[PDB]
Swiss-Prot record, chain B:
It comes from the Eukaryota. Residues 1-8 have a biased composition (Polar residues). Plays a role in protein sorting and trafficking between the trans-Golgi network (TGN) and endosomes. Mediates the ARF-dependent recruitment of clathrin to the TGN and binds ubiquitinated proteins and membrane cargo molecules with a cytosolic acidic cluster-dileucine (DXXLL) motif. Mediates export of the GPCR receptor ADRA2B to the cell surface. Required for targeting PKD1:PKD2 complex from the trans-Golgi network to the cilium membrane. Regulates retrograde transport of proteins such as phosphorylated form of BACE1 from endosomes to the trans-Golgi network. Belongs to the GGA protein family. It comes from Homo sapiens (Human). The chain holds residues 381 to 388 of 639 of the full protein. Ubiquitously expressed. This is ADP-ribosylation factor-binding protein GGA1. Phosphorylated by CK2 and dephosphorylated by PP2A. Phosphorylation of GGA1 allows the internal DXXLL motif to bind the VHS domain and to inhibit the recognition of cargo signals. Monomer. Interacts with GGA2 and GGA3. Binds to clathrin and activated ARFs, including ARF1, ARF5 and ARF6. Interacts with RABEP1. Interacts with RABGEF1. Interacts with the type-I membrane proteins LRP3, M6PR/CD-MPR and IGF2R/CI-MPR. Interacts (via N-terminal VHS domain) with SORL1/sorLA and SORT1 (via C-terminal cytosolic domain). Interacts with EPN4. Interacts with CCDC91. Interacts with HEATR5B/p200a. Interacts with SYNRG/gamma-synergin. Interacts (via GAE doamin) with NECAP1 and NECAP2. Interacts (via GAE domain) with AFTPH/aftiphilin. Interacts with TSG101 and UBC. Interacts with RNF11. The VHS domain functions as a recognition module for sorting signals composed of an acidic cluster followed by two leucines (DXXLL motif). The GAT domain is responsible for interaction with ARF-GTP, UBC and RABEP1. Required for recruitment to the TGN it prevents ARF-GTP hydrolysis. It is found in: Golgi apparatus, trans-Golgi network membrane; Endosome membrane; Early endosome membrane.
Length: 129, 8
């Protein structure tokens, strides 16, 4: 599942997961996930909180995001992008399932979103970067 | 099942 997975796509707010692994070269237990976010929306999106959960055999860890908001889309310029790292410990090499909780505000509404991600690269190939 | 959700 090497290619970038779209975790979220509504109201023109997209969140993708990008896959990698570290840090002992030797090991194949921790997956690095860079989660990138772009907006195409006409009104800006602010107060972004992305949470994640995993099954009891695994462990997830969310580093602070590069930011918390995105401007109204201005197609003329380079788009703004939020980027966040998350680390997924799974030494038992069990099946990979993740459940996110997305929170953001756009105009006067506040979206409280939840979804499942299952398209992870199989734990075997985590050593191979 | 699974653990609780995790924040930043």
């Amino acid at each position: 599942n090497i290619l970038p997975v779209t975790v979220y796509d509504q109201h023109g707010f997209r969140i993708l997961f990008h896959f990698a692994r570290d840090p002992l070269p030797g090991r194949s237990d921790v997956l690095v996930v860079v989660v990138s976010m772009l907006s195409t929306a006409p009104q800006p999106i602010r107060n972004i909180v992305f949470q994640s959960a995993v099954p009891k055999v695994m462990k997830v860890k969310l580093q602070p995001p590069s930011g918390t908001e995105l401007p109204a889309f201005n197609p003329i310029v380079h788009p703004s992008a939020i980027t966040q790292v998350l680390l997924l410990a799974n030494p038992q090499k069990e099946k990979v399932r993740l459940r996110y909780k997305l929170t953001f505000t756009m105009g006067d509404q506040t979206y409280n979103e939840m979804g499942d991600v299952d398209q992870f690269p199989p734990p075997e190939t985590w050593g191979s970067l | 099942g699974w653990n609780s959700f995790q924040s930043s």
